[PDB]
Amino acid sequence: KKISGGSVVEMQGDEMTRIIWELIKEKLIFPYVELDLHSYDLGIENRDATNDQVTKDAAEAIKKHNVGVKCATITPDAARVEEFKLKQMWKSPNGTIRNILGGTVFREAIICKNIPRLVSGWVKPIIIGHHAYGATDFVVPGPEITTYLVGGVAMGMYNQDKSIEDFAHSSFQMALSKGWPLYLSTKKYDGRFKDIFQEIYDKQYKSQFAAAAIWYEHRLIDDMVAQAMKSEGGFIWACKNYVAQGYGSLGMMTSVLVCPDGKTVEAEAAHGTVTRHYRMYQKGQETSTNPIASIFAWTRGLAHRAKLDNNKELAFFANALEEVSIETIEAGFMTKDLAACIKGLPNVQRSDYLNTFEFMDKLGENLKIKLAQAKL
Amino acid sequence: KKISGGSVVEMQGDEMTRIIWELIKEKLIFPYVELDLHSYDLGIENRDATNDQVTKDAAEAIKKHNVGVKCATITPDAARVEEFKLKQMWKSPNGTIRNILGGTVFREAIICKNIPRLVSGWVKPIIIGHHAYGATDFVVPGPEITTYLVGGVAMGMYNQDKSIEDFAHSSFQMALSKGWPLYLSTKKYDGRFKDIFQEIYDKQYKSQFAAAAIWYEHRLIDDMVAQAMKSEGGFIWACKNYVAQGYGSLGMMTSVLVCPDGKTVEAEAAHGTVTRHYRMYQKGQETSTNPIASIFAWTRGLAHRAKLDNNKELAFFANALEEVSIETIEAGFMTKDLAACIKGLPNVQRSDYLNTFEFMDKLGENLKIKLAQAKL
Ligand SMILES: *OP(=O)(O)O[C@@H]1[C@H](O)[C@@H](COP(=O)(O)OP(=O)(O)OC[C@H]2O[C@@H](N3C=CCC(C(N)=O)=C3)[C@H](O)[C@@H]2O)O[C@H]1n1cnc2c(N)ncnc21
Ligand SMILES: *OP(=O)(O)O[C@@H]1[C@H](O)[C@@H](COP(=O)(O)OP(=O)(O)OC[C@H]2O[C@@H](N3C=CCC(C(N)=O)=C3)[C@H](O)[C@@H]2O)O[C@H]1n1cnc2c(N)ncnc21
Ligand SMILES: O=C(O)C[C@H]1CCN(c2ccc(C(=O)N[C@@H]3[C@@H]4C[C@@H]5C[C@H]3C[C@@](O)(C5)C4)c(SC3CCCCC3)n2)C1
Ligand SMILES: O=C(O)C[C@H]1CCN(c2ccc(C(=O)N[C@@H]3[C@@H]4C[C@@H]5C[C@H]3C[C@@](O)(C5)C4)c(SC3CCCCC3)n2)C1
């Protein structure tokens, strides 16, 4: 009999990540877990038909059930307005959900031994989160802020303390959850971030970090980058300042929005819908899309659900699926992007990787085997 | 007979870098070059005695003679106010000179084959410059900028176009001088930097870069860092945003303030006075201070002087001194910081490095040999 999963808020996406989403739901989750799934179709067509209301409804559902799992959606531009005949250029769903829930988005890459990383010395995962908004910029033609005194360009921003307290609480809750030490990086206004972090830490998180064998320290980003390059990793990085690019493969990058209460979490893939692979999929050409980010979104969601419900079966299942993914990649079975991470894209042959459906089938067989091995 | 050097503005410093400054002047420069040296003693005692006027006078002298060579000075704090009984906590001389002259400071590390760098893939020098100021920050107790609308913390900044044009001109003049491609990194207000750089480039620097076999491109800093880590180097990096730390040894780091006109240049060591080594020097203990940054400040100053005067002898001499330094370090003779860069500080023995005066004597012998080898 399947595990009793619980209440999970599902958010369906677009294009290739939508295909991968249904594949993961049918091959890795539903055959073994029975969920109270609150499905919200965040497709661009459904978003346009409901005037982007389904995104608000889904965010409220995450606020109610404390667990959300999101697929990659389309942030529309003008070309997207033409492609789907949209009634408007809708806002980013991630920004709407992040604004309704609050908290902080944390990104982490999945580590495999045979997949080279940006720095060889890195051994343990490095989780990175940034302070979101939730600032006025105008141009001065020719020759104050209230009252202080400030052609060219003038911009003035205001940041409430509530956002600093939410960022601090989210960082501390994340560090307590993962069990890694927390480091804050900054660069007069920045003098308040350090004092608020230190006060909330000393008053509400000192004995918790001490019991968790972790700690919190403050750094300058100039020191944080250099020290991070010459370290083994294994830490949470709260970055200040005011997607990704080329720091590894995007199929291994995962994202988790964490609310300051420490109970509401949204997991999703850090990459996008992977549009090019979807264009090759529509014409019927062979694709090789990496499903690790979405799978780990599901396993992070089920993991936090198990933590909230104290469901040991669900936690063991999510951890088991993560282990199946990492072990499958380490055994030599991977998509084309990882083989390109190993041998380099020019030297990549067809025998060096599996396509999308072959890799999903491999993960299905290996997950079935590992779950069958749990016979005590 | 000595070379006719020309007019050079000298700025004497403090403590260990002052000792090294006199050593370099007596061992590597004066025996071979006859300079119209406009010496300005920027010592903390002389700065305090003249109410920091000697810094202004020196900066004006650099503005007149287009060439400046500066030693490391002391930026005083409270402890420095007590140490020298200062009449005031004087401002940074580098900021005063940089404000009087304008331009942009560019930092570059000296490369040696046996001295490991932060990334193994780096082969060619990476020069990095930032946009200086030359912004109001206040606290809001409880519940606009003119007129646009903006407890907490509020800050408002204003940046004229003249600073953007000076930063652009200085970056283009630097890229033309060194012969490396220029890359600008940014992150609404930032939309003007790109347009000003592109306009000044297309109207005043296109055929110059084309003739110099270089080019200019715009990047996002998120892409600039990742792409820079997976490149061989050899470029100028104009960084926007709004000393060093641990990106190598500070004894190999050099700084050059470049005015937008492309004719006025100030060279100095990127590191500070190295106070600890001076404390070991006062007690009579053996020290091992790296003189490469100050030597390369002198050779950069003499190099720009030779370029302004079309003095081929002076340029050949400065380049010869740089070659003597790099070749001497590559031959196995170095200070303790470089030996620590090789074998690691715990595994560093006394036989792995030379002290300060031994290294200066070695550079004297090798420079004498190379200059004697120039017998055609
Ligand atoms: O072919 P190759 O592997 O070189 O290139 C692929 C892929 O094309 C590229 C990035 O694709 P991407 O979807 O990550 O980003 P992009 O296509 O520019 O944006 C497309 C689409 O995604 C929406 N986003 C963006 C970010 C997150 C997000 C969300 N809702 O959470 C939505 C944008 O709005 C836009 O409409 O890199 C290669 N790539 C990326 N990921 C890959 C995987 N998993 N497997 C293989 N290659 C992958
Ligand atoms: O002993 P070890 O090699 O580990 O440490 C030395 C040195 O102590 C340390 C940095 O010394 P520093 O002078 O670079 O920076 P610091 O001592 O913190 O500041 C001292 C003094 O310098 C003035 N500055 C600062 C920056 C530039 C500057 C200027 N006017 O241009 C002035 C400050 O105001 C302050 O009063 O790192 C090691 N180190 C640095 N440089 C070394 C060399 N050349 N050789 C060997 N070790 C060196
Ligand atoms: O030539 C050498 O071998 C030594 C040089 C090479 C690199 N270097 C410095 C010297 C100084 C710096 C440096 O100051 N980095 C800062 C920049 C870039 C980012 C990190 C820091 C804060 C920030 O706000 C963002 C501004 C750097 S940044 C480095 C570039 C390469 C990729 C990682 C980030 N690099 C000194
Ligand atoms: O776990 C892995 O193997 C993949 C992770 C590890 C590193 N990583 C990312 C993923 C994303 C980023 C990243 O977004 N870097 C930006 C930060 C830090 C600085 C560079 C960029 C602009 C900036 O303003 C300054 C803000 C980074 S920064 C990197 C950290 C390590 C030293 C060099 C600079 N790193 C993805």
Side-chain angles (χ1 to χ4, degrees), chain B residues 91-97 99-132 134-147 149-186 188 190-241 244-281:
Chain B
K91 303 175 178 57
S92 172
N94 312 89
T96 302
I97 299 176
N99 181 87
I100 295 182
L101 302 182
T104 300
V105 167
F106 290 83
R107 298 173 179 85
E108 169 195 6
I110 304 310
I111 300 181
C112 295
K113 296 182 179 59
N114 59 339
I115 300 302
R117 303 175 70 187
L118 181 52
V119 180
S120 63
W122 289 346
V123 184
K124 291 168 291 185
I126 299 176
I127 301 185
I128 300 180
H130 307 274
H131 183 204
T136 310
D137 200 336
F138 69 98
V139 185
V140 181
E144 288 182 328
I145 170 178
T146 181
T147 303
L149 202 157
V150 182
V153 176
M155 47 288 187
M157 59 183 304
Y158 176 74
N159 186 20
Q160 296 195 15
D161 288 21
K162 180 62 186 304
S163 298
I164 313 179
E165 299 170 351
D166 289 337
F167 182 53
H169 276 286
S170 298
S171 302
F172 292 134
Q173 292 288 345
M174 165 59 71
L176 285 175
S177 176
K178 286 310 190 69
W180 294 116
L182 178 63
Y183 290 92
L184 170 64
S185 64
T186 55
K188 298 173 56 185
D190 301 328
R192 166 157 289 191
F193 255 84
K194 188 177 182 179
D195 301 336
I196 288 187
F197 269 73
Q198 195 64 32
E199 181 188 7
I200 298 183
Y201 174 78
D202 287 328
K203 295 298 181 179
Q204 307 177 46
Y205 291 101
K206 186 119 182 180
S207 61
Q208 289 69 23
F209 273 55
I214 55 178
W215 63 97
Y216 161 75
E217 295 180 6
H218 179 271
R219 290 292 199 276
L220 292 183
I221 183 175
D222 312 87
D223 301 30
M224 186 62 183
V225 176
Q227 291 171 15
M229 254 177 296
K230 294 186 299 180
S231 63
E232 298 178 350
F235 53 89
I236 320 295
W237 182 6
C239 201
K240 234 299 285 180
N241 306 327
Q245 215 62 258
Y247 297 87
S249 183
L250 295 182
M252 311 291 289
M253 207 73 60
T254 59
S255 167
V256 275
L257 178 63
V258 174
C259 294
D261 52 36
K263 304 304 178 64
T264 307
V265 169
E266 177 207 343
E268 61 169 336
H271 60 70
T273 65
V274 195
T275 303
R276 184 179 64 91
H277 297 196
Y278 184 65
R279 302 311 187 191
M280 310 184 71
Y281 171 81

Side-chain angles (χ1 to χ4, degrees), chain A residues 175-176 179-180 207-215:
Chain A
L176 285 175
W180 294 116
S207 61
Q208 289 69 23
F209 273 55
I214 55 178
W215 63 97

